[PDB]
Every structure is written in structure tokens, then in C-alpha cells.
Ligand binder design. Structure first.
Ligand code: CLR
Ligand code: CLR
Ligand code: YLX
Lengths: 55, 232, 276, 216, 334
């Protein structure tokens, strides 16, 4: 199938045309978000029963 | 969505009549239904309540035992059988649509009403302001008082704001304090805390002229304020 | 001591019965895969046998151990009524389970359509109603150191036929019909491995009906043969104490063994006990 | 509770009552998963009983059947096959006159039947096997032998023996003592396949009830 | 052209390997592991009489919609456990349900190949079907509202679609998956969404352009569940190979693998905590397992369902977790 092959090849071409950061920077960003929002995560730190809407 | 009441007219004192309301255009069986009356010169006075499914019925303490509320869900009709019709029972009786679930807006649609003419612990809702003078484009803050904190431990404040424009039915503005009703422009606003509440009209037009009513819905002795008339 | 060993055996039997039926009830309440009409009947039989094991078996054990009725007489009649009520109710739960199974097996359309937990409640109510209908006349006008059921001939017939012999006839008829229906289903089912499986199903049906009916019979039939013969053979027949007590406790052992037949042999109950 | 909270609770209770009533009504349904491969007699038996999923609702002898047709789901079957884990029976359609056709048709249906039989969600689900177009099969079996499909047949080329061999090959993949395969021969002119389904469903219910009592 | 495709794939994997300097596990060995997430069933939502395939939390973190095979779409007041709405579905074969962020609409769909849009706020007090979105030739496995007028759906026809609810038409079709698509997760900015499919691949789609920006292939079995990380720069998939994976959008590579040897069943649902440090996955083994997203440690277990946990959602305020399962129950956890 010419059409399927050309579509897949072009799709892979635009796949490769993606700027990729280092995985170290991705992990650093993941930490930055996780500890930058840990104090507002009730599942990570359970809220006091007074502020817990499911008591 | 319409609610058409029938019945009414002149009735001898101590007599009996049965008001009905022929609902159409909405899921009548799923709405709780009220009667709210209004003497020809006085404010709104809640009569009775029949919940959706008829499992819960409430009456005004001044009518309990005398009046009887019933609904015909297959017929989409709400009834008010009246017995021993006193002189105090002369009023325009409004059939009020009302549904109750999380986030619902009770008292959102009101019927046109019928006039019944008779010949010869409840929370006090106070709005002393009356005949407030207004001009178009100005900001007015209608005040309201409650004898008991309308705020519940769930966080809701059960105060309602209705606009009784001249010659037509009351229309919901703010259903639970600071909640704007559908179809109401966001120049009306509700605010308050505890027992004191204010209805703010940011830039009032000539249509905003009418009588503005409080209503608590916390305990279920539904009481209205003495209407705060706004006039040009 | 000869009294202490008897007390120990009877107490262990009572504890095992209480534990078995309490565990059946707990399994039904704590697992909703067991909350269906058939298991409602099974757990109501467990409830009835728990009532036996906690309100009759301790008192009957004390009566056996002390060889006398150390209590009063109104309480003697009360506990005889409890005994008759609860044992009749257990036997008629066996009958209700048989009837429910018979309807499930011979009336699948009713099983899908009309069979509801309300029918299980009705069956339980009927078993308890028969229990009262058998246990009230002795307290009414159809009646120390000896607490015995009314040996009146008419009441003897009415309480042995209505509590065992009519139930035995019903269970025999219902489970024979169930046997024929199961056999017909197996022959409808019936390369030769299918024939071997039909044979295995045949023996499984035989073994299951044997366990059910044989446990019921070998537990209660000796008691009811004695309880029907002796009131008419008062002087001509003498009951040895050892044989009489063993015969009396065979039915209580039925109250012990009903959870085994109907619950602990059930695959669903076994899985629900594994989960708990 | 507030007055509004009380009325919301009342509405929730009315909703729960309606849900309970609807579930009671739905528990009386005999749910049947209809399966097959294209040119089989799936549509024929649907017409005889009488978008991505087609539901056929019919009542026969006071028993209401919900027949679920998933033919138009040209997807990964395993991703939605568990949606019918609780059917009373699978109604599987095989074209008898598909041994001499290729698109091999009978091997395709045979592999599909194997996958459905031995699927983990259908280990104890009985199957009402329909062998459709038995007249077309009889017309094609006098001319073409049952050797294109089955080389190891080594049997007579008559209609009865060839159809029985096909049915045996289809039943051979059960590999389960709990579930049964109810096989029937249909010709698209017969009007008793509703009765065949009803009889098989009653046998399934009876066998399950016996299995509960320990008598099966 | 197959040779060119193979060369391009080799180039893509080499570019991913080049950027794979330090693994997420290696970098996160110096952060404090969360001790034990011992959440407890605060509420049990009873009323569904069949298997629950989908739940979705409201943005108010109090209302939630659940979809069950009983033909009912139930909206719950998760605080009071009240039933707000019981929506009866025309097709009972529902496998997805979405709650509009405005709260005015819910969507559902399944084997009918339709995304049905339900108006929760009509003048009449009933919930009715505003729009039936037809055009998928396979079952709908997920749907998510972009807003009141836009919804993105995934289908077993290997495609995702973006719909204009008012016109009912596919604004965009998202082709490129070779297997059936099980799940969608919208990005927080809703400019782009990820979809996992049965080809064991997750594809990143640009909603406006309609093109597959990135493709993520780490799983060896069907991806049943996909979820964006709270910042929208990463997402987590859950597949039938008993493993969850975290993929970075910018790194275009798998970061973390969430698997335990004693877990062999597939994964039905994934969700993140509000901070994103917890990855909550629902399994076939009847229980939800809580994962330290940064460290791939089982921080907790949400045992409490008697059948396969088919769906789960974390509230937007992060307060609670709901778990729906095949045992017909929704459990709110804290
Ligand atoms: C008081 C206690 C001892 C009563 C217990 C009675 C038990 C042990 C006896 C009574 C009836 C007997 C069963 C009668 C019928 C059969 C069917 C046969 O194919 C296998 C043996 C089997 C299953 C017997 C097993 C033992 C059995 C169940
Ligand atoms: C599992 C069951 C069937 C095992 C059998 C239990 C029953 C039948 C047996 C076990 C212990 C036995 C008891 C042991 C002690 C005595 C005291 C003796 O003075 C009279 C008999 C009597 C009262 C026996 C009655 C029968 C008995 C209760
Ligand atoms: O041990 C006791 C003591 C009691 C009083 C306390 C507990 C019992 C009194 C007593 O007699 N016996 C000896 C055994 C009686 C056995 N039970 C079996 C059930 N019965 C029955 N069931 C249906 C129909 C008719 N009778 C009555 C006899």
C-alpha cells in the first residue's frame, strides 16, 4: 500500500522533528512540581478531620 | 416551563375551595411543589409544601389542619384544598416550582397565581427598607435580616431573593445566598454572613423595578421578609 | 468423673454447633455473593439451629449432666416449647430448602421470573409457624426433677407427624423428584469422556442426596421412632437411659451437622469463608 | 439535616427505589451473546428470534431474552467480551456450507469457537451452537467432499456423517465440565430455533440449579 | 518505504537514548520516600446493580458521575453519598463516562459507538440527551470534555475524535493508532491529549492541529489507562502487562516503570494525586495500588473491592480518591 507507507513515513518524519530535553531535566521538573505542590496534596499529607470533607 | 393555577374567586367565609395548578413543560413529578400566597397589599407568605413523590408534606402553622396540599404526578397537577376559609385567607396564591439536589435552584419558577377573595420558633426574616427610591444606572444594596443564623454547618446559607415585579409572579434572583439564578443578569448579586444579607444591583434598569423579597429555607418554617419595594 | 466427661462432650458439641451456625450466619451477612434466596434459606436454617444450640442445647446438656430438672416447672414448659419450636423449625427449614431446590430444578421459568427473597422469607416464616403450631399446644390445654414433653397420644401423633414424619415424607418426595429431574438432565446431556462425566454426575447426585437425606434420617428418625412408639408402648416398652440419651442427642447433632450439609459443603460458602 | 438536605435525601431515596425496581426487572432477563463470523447464519437466527451493538428482545414461553449482536464491532473482541461475562448462554453461529468456502471459512469459525469456548470470561458459559445452512451444506456435500476443510476426516461423504463430524469437531474444544455446548442444525427455513434456544436456556438454568445443590 | 520507516524509528529511539542521561529512579534516590499511604474508605456509593466501568469526578470535587452496565449513569453527591441524578442510558453497554468541567453536561458511551451528551441543567428537571455523537465505527472507550461544546472521544476503531457538540460533527479525527484506543487524558491546558491503544502505544495529539505529536511505545500489551501528570509535561499509562509507565512529553521517553512481581493482572485505570507524587492504578486483582510516582514504590493499597477495579479518579482539590469496580461499588478514599 503506497498511501499507507507514505503516511507512516511522513508521520515518523514529523515524529523525529521533536526537540527533546534531557531525561535528567524531566526528572528535575517532576520533582519541582511534586515538592512544589506536596503541601496541597491531601492524599500525600492527609488533611485534619476538621478540614477533611469526608469524615 | 409553565405553571398555571386555577380556582380562586369570591368565597364565603368558613367555606371551602380547591386551588389547582396545571403544570406543563417540565418534569413535574421530580419537583417539590409549594403554595406561596400574598395578600393584595402585603408580602409573600408560604402556605404549604409537597415534596416530589408526595412523601414529605409541610404546612404553614397558620393553615396546618385547614389546608391540604396534594399533587397529581400523572396529571401534572398540584392541588390546595382549603377548608374553613377565614378572612386571612384572601390572597393571590402562587404555585412555586422547586427541586432539591446538590446545586439545585429551588423556587426558580413561579406560577401566575389565582386570587382567592374571602368576605365577612419560626425564623423571623426582616427587611425593614421599603419604597427605596432608585434611578437607572445606580447601585442599590437591599438589606435583609434573620432572627437565626441562616448559615448551616454544611456551608450553605439558605436565603433566597425574589423579585415581585408589578403585576406578575415572583421571580428567583439569588437562590442560596450569593448564588445567581438562571436567566438573571449578573448585575444582581447576593452576599451576607450569619444573619445579615444584602442584595446588590450593580446597574439597575427600569425592569429591575419591583418588590424584592427575602426567604429563608433553613428550618422549614419558610418565612419571607416584608418586601423591599424599589420604585423610579 | 463420669459426670465431667459427659459435661465435656456435651459442651464441646454445643460449642461446635454454635460456632458452625454462627459462622454460617456471619458468612452470609459479611459476603453479598451469599445473599440469595437459596442461601437465605440455608442461613435461616443456620439461625434456627443456632437458636437450638444456644437456647436448648445448654439447658438440655445441664439436664443430662445433673440427671434432673434443677429448674422450676413453668421454665420446664418454656424450654420444652423452645426445644419443640426450634427443632421443628430446623426440620422444616430442611423441607423449605428441599422445596426451593425442587422448584429451581423443575421450574426454571419460575426461578428466573417469580423466585424472590420474599419467597425465602415466606418459607422461613412457614417453618417457624409450624414450629409454634407444634410447640404451643403443650403450653395450652393439650398437655419435678423430670422435664419431659407431653406424652399425650394425640399430641404425640400431631407433634411427631407434623415435625418429622410429614417433613420426612415431603423431603423424600421432593428429593426423589429432584433425583429424577437430575437424572433426566444428565441423560439429556448424554468422546466417551462425556459418558464418564454423566456417570460421575450420577454418582455425585446419589452421594449428595444420600448425605442430605441420610444425615437427616439417621439424626432424627431414631428420636421420632422412639417418640412415636413409647407413648403408645408405655409399660410394654422400656427405654434404656444410655440409648435414650444418645437418641435424643442425635437430633441435636443434626442441628450441629446441618451447616456442614448445606453450607460447609457448598462451594460458594467455602470460597466466602476463604475470603473472610 | 437542612430542609434542602432533607429533600435532597428524599430525592436520593426515590432514585434508589427506582434503581432497585429497574434492577429487579433486569434480573429476569435471559442475556444471550450472539457470535459468529460474517456469512454465518447470525442474521438468519436474529430474524428467526424476531450502530455498534444490536439488541434483540424477545419473549418466549414467559421468558424474556436479550440477544446481544456484536457483529458490527470489528474491533479487538477481548476488550469488550467481558461486558457479556454474565450471559446465560452464547449463541454461536456456524455456516455448515462454509467448509468448501474460503474467506478457510470453517477453520475461521472453528478457531473463533475455540477462542470463545476457552475464554476466561466464558469458562462456565454454555453455548447454543447453531450449524446454519444445513440444506446448502447437504447440496454442497454430495458434490464436494469434506476434505478441503478436514483432511484427517477419513469418513463417509454423506450429509449426516459430515455434519456430525463438523459438530464433533466443534464440540471437541469445550475442555470444560461446567459448560455445555447445545448444537442444532438449521436451514434458514426452519421456525423452531426460538424453541431450540429456549430449551437450551432452560437446560442451562436447570443444570446451574443442580450445580448449586451439589447434584451436577 | 518500509526501510525508510525502520530507519526513522531507529533514529527516534537513538534520539531518545541520547537524551536518557540519568534515569528518573537514579535522580530520585535522594528524596524522602512517602511512608505508607493508608487511605480508608470514607464513602461507599451503592446503587449500581452491575459492573461499573467508568467514573469521573466533578471539578467541584464533590459531584461525580459513574457509568455501569445496569444502563444507569448515576451522579453522586460524594459528600453526603446522595444520588443527585440517575440517568438511564439507551445503550446499557457503557464503558466511558465524562463530566463536563462546567458541570452542565455528562457524556457516556460504549458498544453503541456513540458519545451521548446529557444536559444536567435543563429548565425541565430531568436530565436528557443533548447530543448523540455518531461517527465512530468502534466502541467508545473514553471521552473527555474540552469544554461545554468540545469533547474528545477515543474508540475501538483505532481513532480518536474531537467533536463540536452543538453541530454533533467530528471537528477533528485523530488517526494513527493501529489497535483499539482504550483511554484518553486531556492536558490541563486542554490544547493536547494523550491516548493509549491496544497496540501498546501511547500517542500525543494536538487538539487544534489534529496531529500525532509524539508516540510512546514501552508497554508490551494493550494500554487500558492513560493519565497526564498534573503539570501536563508527563503522563502515565496502564496496560495489561501488569505494569504502569511514566512518559515525559518533552523528553519523549519513558521515565519510570510501576510494576511488582507479585502483580500479574492487568491495569484498568490510572490517576495522579494533585501534587502528582502518587500514581493510583486500578488492577484486575480487585484492588487499587498506590505508587510513589517519583520512586516507583507501592506507597499503599486500596483493597476494598470484591471485583476488578475498573475505574478510579482523584478530585481536583486532591482531597479524595474514588474507585469504581466490577463489584458495582464506588468507594471514596482519604
Ligand atoms: C449422626 C451422624 C453420624 C449422621 C451422619 C450420617 C452419614 C455419616 C451417613 C448417613 C447416610 C450416608 C450416605 C448414604 C448414601 C451415600 C451415597 C453413596 O454413593 C456414597 C456414600 C453415601 C454418601 C453415604 C455416606 C455416609 C452417610 C452420609
Ligand atoms: C458429629 C456428631 C454426629 C457426633 C456424634 C455426637 C453425638 C451423637 C454423641 C457425641 C457425644 C455423645 C454423648 C456422650 C455422653 C453421653 C452421656 C451418657 O450418659 C448418655 C449419652 C450421652 C449424652 C452421649 C449422647 C450422644 C453424643 C452427644
Ligand atoms: O434434654 C432435655 C431437656 C429439655 C428441657 C431443656 C431442653 C430440652 C426437655 C427434654 O425433654 N430433654 C430431653 C431431650 C428432648 C429432645 N427434644 C427434641 C425436640 N422435640 C420435638 N421436636 C419436634 C416435635 C416434638 N418434639 C422435643 C424433644
Amino acid at each position: 500500500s503506497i498511501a499507507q507507507a507514505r503516511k507512516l513515513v511522513e508521520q515518523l518524519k514529523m515524529e523525529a522533528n521533536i526537540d527533546r530535553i534531557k531525561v535528567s531535566k524531566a526528572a528535575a521538573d517532576l520533582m519541582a512540581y511534586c515538592e512544589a505542590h506536596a503541601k496541597e496534596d491531601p492524599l500525600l499529607t492527609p488533611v485534619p478531620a476538621s478540614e477533611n470533607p469526608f469524615r | 416551563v409553565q405553571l398555571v393555577e386555577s380556582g380562586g374567586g369570591l368565597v364565603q367565609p368558613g367555606g371551602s375551595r380547591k386551588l389547582s395548578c396545571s403544570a406543563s413543560g417540565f418534569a413535574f413529578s421530580s419537583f417539590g411543589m409549594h403554595w406561596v400566597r400574598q395578600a393584595p397589599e402585603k408580602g409573600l407568605e408560604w402556605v404549604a409544601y409537597i415534596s416530589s413523590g408526595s412523601g414529605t408534606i409541610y404546612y404553614a402553622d397558620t393553615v396546618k389542619g385547614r389546608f391540604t396540599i396534594s399533587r397529581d404526578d400523572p396529571k401534572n397537577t398540584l392541588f390546595l384544598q382549603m377548608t374553613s376559609l377565614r378572612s386571612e385567607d384572601t390572597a393571590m396564591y402562587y404555585c412555586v416550582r422547586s427541586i432539591y439536589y446538590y446545586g439545585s435552584s429551588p423556587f426558580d419558577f413561579w406560577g401566575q397565581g389565582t386570587t382567592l377573595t374571602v368576605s365577612s420558633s419560626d425564623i423571623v426574616m426582616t427587611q425593614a427598607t421599603s419604597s427605596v427610591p432608585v434611578t437607572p444606572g445606580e447601585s442599590v444594596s437591599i438589606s435583609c435580616r434573620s432572627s437565626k443564623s441562616l448559615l448551616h454547618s454544611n456551608g450553605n446559607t439558605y436565603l433566597y431573593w425574589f423579585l415581585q415585579r408589578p403585576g406578575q409572579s415572583p421571580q428567583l434572583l439569588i437562590y442560596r445566598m450569593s448564588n445567581l439564578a438562571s436567566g438573571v443578569p449578573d448585575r444582581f448579586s447576593g452576599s451576607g454572613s450569619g444573619t445579615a444579607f444584602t442584595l446588590t444591583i450593580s446597574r439597575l434598569e427600569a425592569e429591575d423595578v419591583g418588590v424584592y423579597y427575602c426567604m429563608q429555607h433553613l428550618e422549614y418554617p419558610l418565612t419571607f421578609g416584608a418586601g423591599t419595594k424599589l420604585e423610579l | 468423673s463420669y459426670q465431667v466427661i459427659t459435661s465435656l462432650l456435651l459442651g464441646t458439641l454445643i460449642f461446635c454447633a454454635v460456632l458452625g451456625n454462627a459462622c454460617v450466619v456471619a458468612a452470609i451477612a459479611l459476603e453479598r455473593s451469599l445473599q440469595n434466596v437459596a442461601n437465605y434459606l440455608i442461613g435461616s436454617l443456620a439461625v434456627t439451629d443456632l437458636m437450638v444450640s444456644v437456647l436448648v442445647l445448654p439447658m438440655a446438656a445441664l439436664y443430662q449432666v445433673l440427671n434432673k430438672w434443677t429448674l422450676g416447672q413453668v421454665t420446664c414448659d418454656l424450654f420444652i416449647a423452645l426445644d419443640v419450636l426450634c427443632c421443628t423449625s430446623s426440620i422444616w427449614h430442611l423441607c423449605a430448602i428441599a422445596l426451593d431446590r425442587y422448584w429451581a430444578i423443575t421450574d426454571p421459568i419460575d426461578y428466573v421470573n417469580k423466585r424472590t427473597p420474599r419467597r425465602a422469607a415466606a418459607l422461613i416464616s412457614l417453618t417457624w409457624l409450624i414450629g409454634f403450631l407444634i410447640s404451643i399446644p403443650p403450653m395450652l390445654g393439650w398437655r419435678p426433677d423430670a422435664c419431659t414433653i407431653s406424652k399425650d397420644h394425640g399430641y404425640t401423633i400431631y407433634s411427631t407427624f407434623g415435625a418429622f414424619y410429614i417433613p420426612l415424607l415431603l423431603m423424600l418426595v421432593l428429593y426423589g423428584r429432584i433425583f429424577r429431574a437430575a437424572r433426566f438432565r444428565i441423560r439429556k446431556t448424554v468422546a466417551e469422556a462425556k459418558r464418564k462425566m454423566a456417570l460421575a454426575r450420577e454418582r455425585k447426585t446419589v452421594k449428595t442426596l444420600g448425605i442430605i437425606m441420610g444425615t437427616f434420617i439417621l439424626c432424627w428418625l431414631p428420636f421420632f421412632i422412639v417418640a412415636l412408639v413409647l407413648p403408645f408402648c408405655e409399660s410394654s416398652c422400656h427405654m434404656p437411659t444410655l440409648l435414650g440419651a444418645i437418641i435424643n442427642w442425635l437430633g441435636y447433632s443434626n442441628s450441629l451437622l446441618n451447616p456442614v450439609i448445606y453450607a460447609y459443603f457448598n462451594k460458594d460458602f467455602q470460597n466466602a469463608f476463604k475470603k473472610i | 439535616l437542612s430542609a434542602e438536605e432533607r429533600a435532597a435525601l428524599e430525592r436520593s431515596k426515590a432514585i434508589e427505589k427506582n434503581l432497585k425496581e429497574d434492577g429487579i426487572s433486569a434480573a429476569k432477563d435471559v442475556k444471550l451473546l450472539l457470535l459468529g463470523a460474517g456469512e454465518s447464519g447470525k442474521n438468519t437466527i436474529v430474524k428467526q428470534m424476531k450502530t455498534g451493538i444490536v439488541e434483540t428482545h424477545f419473549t418466549f414461553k414467559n421468558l424474556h431474552f436479550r440477544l446481544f449482536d456484536v457483529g458490527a464491532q470489528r474491533s479487538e473482541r477481548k476488550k469488550w467480551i467481558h461486558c457479556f461475562e454474565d450471559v446465560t448462554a452464547i449463541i454461536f453461529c456456524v455456516a455448515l456450507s462454509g467448509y468448501d468456502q474460503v474467506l478457510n471459512r470453517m477453520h475461521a469459525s472453528l478457531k473463533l469457537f475455540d477462542s470463545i469456548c476457552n475464554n476466561k470470561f466464558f469458562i462456565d458459559t454454555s453455548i447454543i451452537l447453531f450449524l446454519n445452512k444445513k440444506d446448502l451444506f447437504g447440496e454442497k456435500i454430495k458434490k464436494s467432499p469434506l476434505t478441503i476443510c478436514f483432511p484427517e476426516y477419513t469418513g463417509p461423504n454423506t450429509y449426516e456423517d459430515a455434519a456430525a463430524y463438523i459438530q464433533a469437531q466443534f464440540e471437541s474444544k469445550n475442555r470444560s465440565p461446567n459448560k455445555e455446548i447445545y448444537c442444532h442444525m438449521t436451514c434458514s427455513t426452519d421456525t423452531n430455533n426460538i424453541q431450540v434456544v429456549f430449551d437450551a436456556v432452560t437446560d442451562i438454568i436447570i443444570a446451574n440449579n443442580l450445580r448449586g445443590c451439589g447434584l451436577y | 518505504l518500509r526501510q525508510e520507516a525502520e530507519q526513522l524509528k531507529n533514529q527516534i529511539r537513538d534520539a531518545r537514548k541520547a537524551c536518557a542521561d540519568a534515569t528518573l529512579s537514579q535522580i530520585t534516590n535522594n528524596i524522602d520516600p512517602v511512608g505508607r499511604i493508608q487511605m480508608r474508605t470514607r464513602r461507599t456509593l451503592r446503587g449500581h446493580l452491575a459492573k461499573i466501568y467508568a467514573m469521573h469526578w466533578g471539578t467541584d470535587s464533590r459531584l461525580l458521575v459513574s457509568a455501569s452496565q445496569d444502563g444507569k449513569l448515576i451522579i453522586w453527591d460524594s459528600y453526603t453519598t446522595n444520588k443527585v441524578h440517575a440517568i438511564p442510558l439507551r445503550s446499557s453497554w457503557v464503558m466511558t463516562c465524562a463530566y463536563a468541567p462546567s458541570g452542565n453536561y455528562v457524556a457516556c458511551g460504549g458498544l453503541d459507538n456513540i458519545c451521548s451528551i446529557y444536559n444536567l441543567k435543563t429548565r425541565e428537571g430531568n436530565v436528557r440527551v443533548s447530543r448523540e455523537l455518531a461517527g465512530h465505527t468502534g466502541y467508545l472507550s473514553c471521552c473527555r470534555f474540552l469544554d461545554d461544546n468540545q469533547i474528545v472521544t477515543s474508540s475501538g476503531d483505532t481513532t480518536c475524535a474531537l467533536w463540536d457538540i452543538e453541530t454533533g460533527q467530528q471537528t477533528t479525527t485523530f488517526t494513527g493508532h493501529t489497535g483499539d484506543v482504550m483511554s484518553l487524558s486531556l492536558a490541563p491546558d486542554t490544547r493536547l491529549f494523550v491516548s493509549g491503544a491496544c497496540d501498546a502505544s501511547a500517542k500525543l495529539w494536538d487538539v487544534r492541529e489534529g496531529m500525532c505529536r509524539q508516540t510512546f511505545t514501552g508497554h508490551e500489551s494493550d494500554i487500558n489507562a492513560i493519565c497526564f501528570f498534573p503539570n501536563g509535561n508527563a503522563f502515565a499509562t496502564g496496560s495489561d502487562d501488569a505494569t504502569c509507565r511514566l512518559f515525559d512529553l518533552r523528553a519523549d521517553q519513558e521515565l519510570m516503570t510501576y510494576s511488582h512481581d507479585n502483580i500479574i493482572c492487568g491495569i484498568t485505570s490510572v490517576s495522579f494525586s494533585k501534587s502528582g507524587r502518587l500514581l493510583l492504578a486500578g488492577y484486575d486483582d480487585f484492588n487499587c495500588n498506590v505508587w510513589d510516582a517519583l520512586k516507583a514504590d507501592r506507597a499503599g493499597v486500596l483493597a476494598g473491592h470484591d471485583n476488578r477495579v475498573s475505574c478510579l479518579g482523584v478530585t481536583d482539590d486532591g482531597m479524595a480518591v474514588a474507585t469504581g469496580s466490577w463489584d458495582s461499588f464506588l468507594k471514596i478514599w482519604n
